[PDB]
Methyltransferase (Bacillus cereus), 562 residues
Amino acid sequence: YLKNTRDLYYNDDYVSFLVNTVWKITKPVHIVDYGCGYGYLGLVLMPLLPEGSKYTGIDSGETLLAEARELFRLLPYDSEFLEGDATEIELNDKYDIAICHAFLLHMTTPETMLQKMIHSVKKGGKIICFEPHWISNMASYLLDGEKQSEFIQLGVLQKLFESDTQRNGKDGNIGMKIPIYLSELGVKNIECRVSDKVNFLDSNMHHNDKNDLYQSLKEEGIAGDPGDKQQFVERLIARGLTYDNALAQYEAELRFFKALHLHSSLVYAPNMKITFGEIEC
Amino acid sequence: YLKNTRDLYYNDDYVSFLVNTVWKITKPVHIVDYGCGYGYLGLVLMPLLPEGSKYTGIDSGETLLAEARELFRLLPYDSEFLEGDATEIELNDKYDIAICHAFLLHMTTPETMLQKMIHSVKKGGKIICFEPHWISNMASYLLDGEKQSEFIQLGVLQKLFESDTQRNGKDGNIGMKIPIYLSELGVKNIECRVSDKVNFLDSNMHHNDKNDLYQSLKEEGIAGDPGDKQQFVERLIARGLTYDNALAQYEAELRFFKALHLHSSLVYAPNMKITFGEIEC
């Protein structure tokens, strides 16, 4: 969860740079995390934030909160978790910072949820959103020995993701849209940054770290088995793709699954998008 | 050149983070820049490097060096420019750091040129390469009001760039390959980072800065006029694309040209790739 996921998307020194240099957080702050899951964003920022800071996570997963609480019980950070639907929870407090990680992409109406987070922030406070941008993520793959187009059909994926959003409303590319939504909502000093993280599975590095990276990469689902060909094609067709596009997609995922292994050389840049602004004081 | 290009690809605070925190350069260093052009990389790093550092640029552009020299004559940085072909120039010195910016993508044999740069570096020295990754760059566009697939055909561009490389050897996506080449060459402590820069043309920001950003964006060629339709399609077909792909490409560039303007909301992340390592001491 931390030596894996976290380590795959952010360089801790870069996050520290964001906390001390860009955001310049010096005084302890009270932050609220929407859709905190097991407290991932807390395990990332709390260690870097000023001593005396308070972390508050919000989520509906009952068993989820149980793990989060047990996970933070051991840590020296003041943390609390509230059970409830983040889309309707009513907070009685105002926080210095409101954050969320890979949460807005699952909303059918991102703007509304953002409006809510904003309202829980005190004047002069900040809002930080860690959201992905699937399309730029997929385009950020390099596998020595294979042409990217062989195992990644950017065109099909580009149409696919655009379709899904057209339906349910979920946006896997919402990460680059946060700035726009934040603007329409009147947030000030808006700014977006890309996590500088780049994973490098070095075919010439022979150390446990290289092995550990491969393991992390696979536990994330990178280059997974596409499974039954028929089910795959059908499932995709039902999402707005044609039979040819879906087939090309299958063969692509199949190729990646068969091409990536511990001995390979892979360069991957998650391209996570970090957007933030200040609430007009 | 400085309040335009530079400001469009890197956040100065991020570059400072790379110099002081990641690379931890404390003692003054002697750096050599291959294909320095007018000294762009010098105008970026020299201000951040320890006082007493020396910058040396290499390029063949006679008039090019004239501007570079005149540009640095006024600055308080020790700089010199050597005229010659960077692919065959013979240096009589060893440097603390060898760097290059958007230079390796124009080589027909990147590995060889890298081997050369490495040989000009002293034991314990570093090699820094600032190279682009066109595919991830193109995928990092967001224009409010338009679907990305409408003005950017990732699929066609993905095939196009792969083809060009197949021919002349030039790699517009060499930025993610530097780690691999560096590894095969025996470089140690290899690491790659993405510039965290994200440009945001804010349709709700009404300040000279927003106007200045738009101007910079256009001076870079973003959303330029595709020109004569016939010439465009033919020129692309000659690069390995079909007539349909080329046409779809034309209409896409045309759409972007007609859609982007000063009043628009655009989010662009150049996604420049910064790869570096140390020369085994």
User: Anything to note?
Assistant: Chain B touches chain A through 51 residues (CB under 8 Å).
